């Protein structure tokens with residue numbers, strides 16, 4: 001029993017982290033086969049960041065301008081190129097600890113593990129969700145750029161995030177491993193802000209099912225509703241609309257507990273309208289929305 | 302910015318997890334050098350968990366009764382001994398992935414990362430704290446016995462917990478890596494219940510200092526308190542007594558923010574009295590107590 005915010009074991013990713021330095025700027029890189037991936041803004045000075053021409057900035061750099069440190073060993077850069085907002089540095093040495101991996105792009109509401117690093121050395125791992133406004137509520141300090149997010153499916157690491165910047169509200173923005181940003185952000189020093197965020201409804205329902213499996217039942221009631229009736233409640237309380245695909249995904253938890261999804265949305269409907277009334281759910285006075293249905297099934301079964 | 306309950310990178314511990322089987326029982330073991338550590342109740346049968354005589358059960362065991370599996374490879378057991386509540390199986394091969402390590406017995410209020418494991422394969426990693434009643438609020442299913450808790454400091458892994466059992470209230474009990482249980486618990490299936498748990502006061506205060514560091518001051522007030530007056534109030538909310546040691550531990554966080562410890566103690570007194578008024582602190586609607594003073598300085 002028990003329910004915790006749980007991250008994937010980070011060992012397969014720890015063996016891929018390196019330090020990348022170009023001039024004054026030093027950040028983290030991902031070393032896979034004979035290529036090191038890192039944010040392209042490593043090539044930018046403080047003035048370059050205000051309005052950078054990356055293609056022109058990179059055409060003036062050469063291989064020797066990139067110092068790549070894999071622990072205690074230098075890696076010699078033999079090539080450099082850009083894909084979107086990610087810099088690809090071909091190195092002379094293939095990483096012997098390269099795991100089976102893929103580059104995947106996640107959807108808002110899906111979760112992943114983040115390995116926070118500084119100077120190519122991992123310092124911590126935590127779980128987070130891609131918010132509907134395409135930010136993540138991470139914990140990063142200076143030098144965290146190049147930190148990566150990932151999921152593990154059996155033997156294969158699915159890399160889905162690389163950290164690029166922090167927004168003025170304290171949340172964070174990055175790209176997939178092919179350099180495409182999550183959200184309407186650019187890698188330069190301008191006035192950027194996160195849009196208004198919403199709550200991931202399907203994840204809240206999954207978390208309520210996790211509470212029922214763990215013995216928390218006080219919020220269940222005799223009632224049920226329809227998808228249209230509930231989605232009116234969801235929009236009023238700044239929740240994401242619940243779709244029929246969401247109901248299908250929640251199917252296993254509904255069968256395993258005898259609580260239909262619309263049956264459970266009636267509970268959530270009453271929780272949104274009336275509150276929790278002093279009581280807690282899984283040790284929380286907030287409605288948790290950073291557990292996917294898969295997260296609940298994997299941890300609770 | 303931001304504040305997450307962050308675990309240590311688990312890689313150095315993943316390379317040490319193995320599968321230990323005896324009879325029909327399978328659980329996890331920790332493979333360091335040429336020794337595999339695992340809970341001694343791996344040798345118990347159905348008829349045994351009420352009043353096991355571990356000495357009598359172990360004397361009937363041979364080395365080849367223990368099957369140790371590291372990944373896909375069988376390790377050959379060449380010896381076995383019992384130290385308190387843990388079994389130590391000597392194996393023919395030293396673990397080539399053995400990190401720098403030591404064994405530490407921790408105090409209530411200390412935090413550590415847990416690598417949850419099943420059949421010697423790691424499942425997930427999360428952060429926990431030793432509660433004042435010597436239990437932990439973990440996430441464990443059948444087959445997780447032998448999972449370990451640890452901290453990492455400058456590539457040295459300090460192992461501080463091994464999981465043994467779940468109590469009827471859904472919380473978990475275990476030993477240090479010398480086999481000594483945390484708290485009054487025993488590896489027996491008789492009636493035993495955790496004492497009434499309390500809130501780790503020194504951790505809440507450190508977490509309040511962390512909220513100030515990240516730019517939030519709404520919960521402060523103009524008052525102070527004596528140490529004894531604070532403890533008279535806090536214990537009425539089932540908070541742990543705050544000692545002069547705890548006041549000393551908070552010195553650095555007080556100096557960085559400019560808020561004396563007893564002034565932050567006054568703010569905590571008011572928070573317990575008022576609640577949060579629909580506000581949050583570092584993203585939570587409750588007072589968090591599983592960040593230590595050491596943890597806050599490390600993350601902030």
Ligand SMILES: C[C@H](O)c1ccn[nH]1
Nearest residue numbers: 140141142165166302
């Ligand atoms: C705090 C530091 O500037 C940073 C960079 C990206 N995230 N956080």
Ligand SMILES: C[C@H](O)c1ccn[nH]1
Nearest residue numbers: 001441442443466467
């Ligand atoms: C509940 C499950 O049987 C378990 C075993 C050890 N911890 N939790």
Ligand code: NA
Nearest residue numbers: 221223263266
């Ligand atoms: Na209902």
